[PDB]
Amino acid sequence: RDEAGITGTWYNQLGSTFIVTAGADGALTGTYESAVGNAESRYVLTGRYDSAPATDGSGTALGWTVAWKNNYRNAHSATTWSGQYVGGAEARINTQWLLTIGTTEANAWRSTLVGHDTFTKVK
Amino acid sequence: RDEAGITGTWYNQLGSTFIVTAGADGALTGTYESAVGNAESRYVLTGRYDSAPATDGSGTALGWTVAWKNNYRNAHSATTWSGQYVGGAEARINTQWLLTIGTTEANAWRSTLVGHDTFTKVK
Amino acid sequence: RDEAGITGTWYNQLGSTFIVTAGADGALTGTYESAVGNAESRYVLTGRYDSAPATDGSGTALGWTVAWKNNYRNAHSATTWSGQYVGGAEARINTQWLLTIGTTEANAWRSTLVGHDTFTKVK
Amino acid sequence: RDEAGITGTWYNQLGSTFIVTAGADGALTGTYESAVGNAESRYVLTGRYDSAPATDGSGTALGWTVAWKNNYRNAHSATTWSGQYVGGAEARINTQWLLTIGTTEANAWRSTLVGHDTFTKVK
Incomplete structure (x- = not known):
């Protein structure tokens, strides 16, 4: 449904860029380039989205x-984004994310950043 | 490094089950069965992990x-888990998760649950 | 430092309103009115802020x-906001929040919403 | 209702300690001592709880x-805990927390840790 709507290049308020293909099966494959942090160039990303969303003008969970x-x-870390795609003239992906850094069990309590990213097709 | 350590069947405190293969490339492919919620049987899961973790007895981000x-x-929702694999006798995956439910823009504020899951190889 | 800057009436993107007094001691006392949810009229709020922030143009944690x-x-729930006050022409409070709803131990996994609120002095 | 149940000294899995008084009005006043981080001795804490919880064996939001x-x-930071008190033989406070560190607007994206604390009356 939102396969074509999701597929493409997205930008967030930090200037990071996200190229994604949505498969018909709910797969998400692409690359991420972060404008900030201990990152440089592209990083593989994989994910899932609901390929049959509610038809009541809800967003698509992904x-x-x-x-x-x-x-x-290698930043010894991993981010997950959780959010919804909302289509329409100004299509957007609204996400919250969790970033976990590899740590010892002692420093575990301080191992996880949390934030929110909004993605648009306009940079 | 933690490819074999990660690959396998994991259980969380809710009784949910998580079968995962770690590729050498940092890929994670498997299935999830949730003991709770609007879920039944297996759901595809995809993910990533750091395939070259710090060698200072840190965990592996994934x-x-x-x-x-x-x-x-179809629950019109998606969960992401962010966490670290910590190996050793009682190997564990400590995660925090974000669950997003498809919603209208009005109800967006209340679209996202947050929790934590601990996974062991023992159910 | 940011006592006068924090004290006042703030509005968030949902149309909710937040009246706060900052004490010299780091106290925050006020009322909150939520534009959404199971809420009506004002609710007591209490909190803390750093009354001696870094002087390197950091925000004030609160x-x-x-x-x-x-x-x-009575909504059987409680929200906490965690964020920073950033002063200047367009002063803002950037927050992430956790909302917990009273539940049984079984439904605990689904007891907590997470979101973000931005507060300005302009509604 | 859970005024006496909440009031007292609590300990979390990190070895931190939390002394709290619940007022009849829903107030929470006390001190926190963190076993970890940039902390030493006691820190004022203020909060709220639902003083009339559901009587269906739900927890009390606080x-x-x-x-x-x-x-x-001064750590230029602030933590909020959101959770429920669950009474009974092994009474517990199950929380998720957000810790915000004062930062510049550039480093804002990385300003907030997230975790979970379980509190018992037994250390």
Whole structure:
């Protein structure tokens, strides 16, 4: 349903960029480039979305993960985004995210950042 | 590194079950069965993990997503887990998760549950 | 420092309103009126802020709680906001919040909404 | 209702300690001592709880805030806990928390830790 609507290049308020393909099966495959943090170039991302959303003008639930390792850097961390795609003239992906950094069991309590990202097709 | 350690069947305190394969590339593919909620049987999951973790006895950062649609039910929702694998005798995956339910823009404020799951290899 | 800057009436993107006094001691006392949810009229709020913030143009960390009970309604729930006050022409309070609803131990997993609120002095 | 049940000294899995008085009005006043982080000795805490909970064996929603400034240290940060008190033989407070550190607008994205604390009356 929102396969074509989701597929494409998205930008968030930090200037990060997210290229995604939605499969018909609910798959999400793409790359993420973060404008901030210990990151450089593209990182594989994988995820899922509801390929048959409510038809009552609800958004489409989706999420994806990025492990922050590629050929340039390893940040020993992983972010997941959870959110909804809302289509229409100004289509957007509204997300909250959890970023976990590898740590010892002692420092576990302080292992996880939380934030929110809004994605548009306009940078 | 933690490829074999991660790969396998995991259980959480709710009685949910998580079968995962770690690829050498940082991929995570598997199925999730939730003991609770609007869920029944298995749901595809995809994710990522750091395949080269710090060697200072840190955990391995990883995450994954489940869209709650399969052939039996569609819950119009998606969960992402963010966490670390910690190996050793009692290996565990400590996660926090975000669950987003498809909604209208008005009800967006109340679209996202947050929780924590601990996974062990013992049910 | 940000005592006068914090003290006053704030509005968020949902149309909710937040009247707060900052004490010199780091106290926050006021009332909250939510434009949404099972709420009506004002609810006591209490909180804390850092009364001696970094002087390097950082924000001022603060938080507060609202139990959603007053003389009109009891929602069996409580929200905490965690955030920073950033002063200047367009002063703002950027928050993430956790809303917990009283539940049985079984339904605990689904007891907590998470969101973000931005507060301005302009409605 | 849970005024006496809540009032007292609580301990969490990190070894932190939380002394709280519940007022009849839904107020929570006390001190927090964190076993970890940039903290030392006691920090004022203020909060709210539902003083008339559902009588269907639900928990009591409550929350509180600690600004991490006292006479020994200033951590430029604030934690809020959101959770429920569940009474009975092994009474517990199950919480999720948000910790915000004062930052510049650039580093805002990485300003907020998230975690969970379980409190018991047994250390």
